[model samples]
Target chain A: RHYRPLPPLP
Target chain B: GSTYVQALFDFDPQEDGELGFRRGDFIHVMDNSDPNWWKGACHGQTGMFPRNYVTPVNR
Candidate 1:
């Protein structure tokens, strides 16, 4: 199960 | 080496463990005695998400 991952912030 | 040292202390994790084991990591610097590094410093150590089994009292 994968949790919600936010994209790398620039 | 049996029961003793309630008066003093026996478990020397720093010295005894240092002699037994060694660790290598890539970092710019290491300051063991840095005052800013306390028990709950958020950035001082790495967070792990692995699962391991151990005694309940270990916590």
Candidate 2:
């Protein structure tokens, strides 16, 4: 799978 | 504050003055005057791209 979309913060 | 955006899809510039980006790329939003088109910078260049191509990183 590709990289996951980042959330507002890690 | 620095505004950041994340590319939702790959975009190839269809004309000059338009920014191109690949999916998952992070972009710095400079102007969002037009909801349909936003000015941003990536890969050392600044240009307009489809607003739908990205989502705000910090809201």
By TM-score, the best candidate is 2
lDDT of 1 by residue, B1-59 (tens): 31111101111112211111112211111222222211111123321111110001111
**What DockQ does each listed candidate score?**
0.03, 0.03
- DockQ for model 2 equals 0.03
Which stretches in model 2 have alpha-carbon errors above 4 Å? A1-10
Residue B38 error for model 1, in Å? 21
TM-score of chain A of each: 0.42, 0.33
Relative to the unseen true structure, what is the C-alpha lDDT of residue B45 in candidate 1, on a scale of 0 to 100? 35
lDDT of 2: 0.69
Worst 10 residues of 1 chain B by lDDT: B49-58
TM-score of each: 0.13, 0.75
lDDT of 2 by residue, B1-59 (tens): 46768788776676777777888777678787765667887567778877677777874
